Design a protein around this nucleic acid. Structure first.
Ligand SMILES: [Ba+2]
Ligand SMILES: [Ba+2]
Ligand SMILES: [Ba+2]
Ligand SMILES: [Ba+2]
Length: 345
DNA sequence: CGCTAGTCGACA
DNA sequence: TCGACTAGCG
């Protein structure tokens, strides 16, 4: 996500309880709970031992939400965006490297620091997620697998009014333009809410409380799609945008050295990357639960060629998208693994 | 000041 | 995988 984003914007946060959303619909970044629940069984997962502790963990928050008369929508990650296909396979190996230290330290007498490495060799698989889905469906709780990043899917549900808020631990959800976010929510419903309208109560931001500018700042500060120019963080990135009153972000970026009173030359690999990163936050493919069709997160503008946005995600027959979204089609093999039909229940 | 990239803790 | 917390470097 965005390094230190929450701390930068903490002026816009607010302690709340989920009861607040009684009678309403809330989308969940279920992965966050999955990872946390995976912690309790990192050891067992590695040895291939049969563990389901992360399922019960996810259900604890789910049943907490239901007990307060809340309608949860569990959203899950899907395929890996092109353009991060590489940056991700990269983790594949480092996540396997840390799984090596555990095994040696466990056979030395140290079982205390060996375990610290297993938490970092934790691999949240699709099969693990599918288990959680079966549990949720069994309590009548709706589940939705995003075509690509749950971030965009979650953002879409919120902007479309399907859900009134999003429960997540992820910072760069705001960058996708979602209105209400609930961070740090615990088992009992005590969370820390961030409303997009309260961005204006951040002095540090100043004039960059608009969604477009807020997004430019986040990217300049350094996102997943594009690392920032080294020496640029939230404050500097904010400063540039908060200073240059020019609707032409392209020309603005090429003057970064001028605004910061620094001396940086704006490479070519970055100006293009910013355009792509931006197109990824705007137009990443999501699934419209209502019509049942694959769509971009935002309607295309008049200055965007859709045929060039393969890096934000590739389309598929809406039927294929439906089976993936329902959690029937395996992500990697595109091989059906379940026979679930939302219409018949 | 603020960045950065560094480590370190998350659960129980 | 993330975010939080710090040590030093503009
Ligand atoms: Ba993310
Ligand atoms: Ba996420
Ligand atoms: Ba950075
Ligand atoms: Ba301005």
């Amino acid at each position: 996500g965005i390094q230190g984003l929450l701390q930068f914007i903490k002026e816009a946060s607010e302690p709340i309880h989920v009861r607040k959303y009684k009678g309403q619909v809330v989308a969940v970044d279920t992965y966050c709970w999955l990872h946390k629940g995976a912690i309790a069984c990192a050891e067992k997962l590695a040895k291939g031992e049969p563990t389901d502790r992360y399922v019960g963990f996810c259900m604890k928050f789910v049943n907490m939400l239901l007990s307060h008369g809340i309608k949860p929508i569990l959203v899950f990650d899907g395929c890996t965006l092109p353009s991060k296909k590489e940056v991700e396979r990269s983790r594949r190996e480092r996540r396997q490297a840390n799984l090596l230290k555990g095994k040696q330290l466990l056979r030395e007498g140290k079982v205390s620091e060996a375990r610290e490495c297993f938490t970092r060799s934790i691999n949240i698989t699709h099969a693990m997620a599918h288990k959680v889905i079966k549990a949720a469906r069994s309590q009548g709780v709706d589940c939705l697998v995003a075509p690509y990043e749950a971030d965009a899917q979650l953002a879409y549900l919120n902007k479309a009014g399907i859900v009134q808020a999003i429960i997540t631990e992820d910072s760069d959800l705001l960058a996708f333009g979602c209105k209400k976010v609930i961070l740090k929510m615990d088992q009992f419903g005590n969370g820390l809410e961030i409303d997009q309208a309260r961005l204006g109560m951040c002095r540090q931001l100043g004039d960059v409380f608009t969604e477009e500018k807020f997004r430019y700042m986040c990217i300049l500060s350094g996102c997943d799609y594009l690392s920032s120019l080294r020496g640029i963080g939230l404050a500097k990135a904010c400063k540039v945008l908060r200073l240059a009153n020019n609707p032409d972000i392209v020309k603005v970026i090429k003057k970064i050295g001028h605004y910061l009173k620094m001396n940086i030359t704006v490479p070519e690999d970055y100006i293009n990357g910013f355009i792509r990163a931006n197109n990824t936050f705007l137009y990443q493919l999501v699934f419209d639960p209502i019509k049942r069709k694959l769509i971009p997160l935002n309607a295309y503008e008049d200055d965007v060629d859709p045929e060039t946005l393969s890096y934000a995600g590739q389309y598929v027959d809406d039927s294929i998208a439906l089976q993936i979204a329902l959690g029937n089609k395996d992500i990697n093999t595109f091989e059906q693994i379940d026979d679930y039909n939302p219409d018949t229940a």
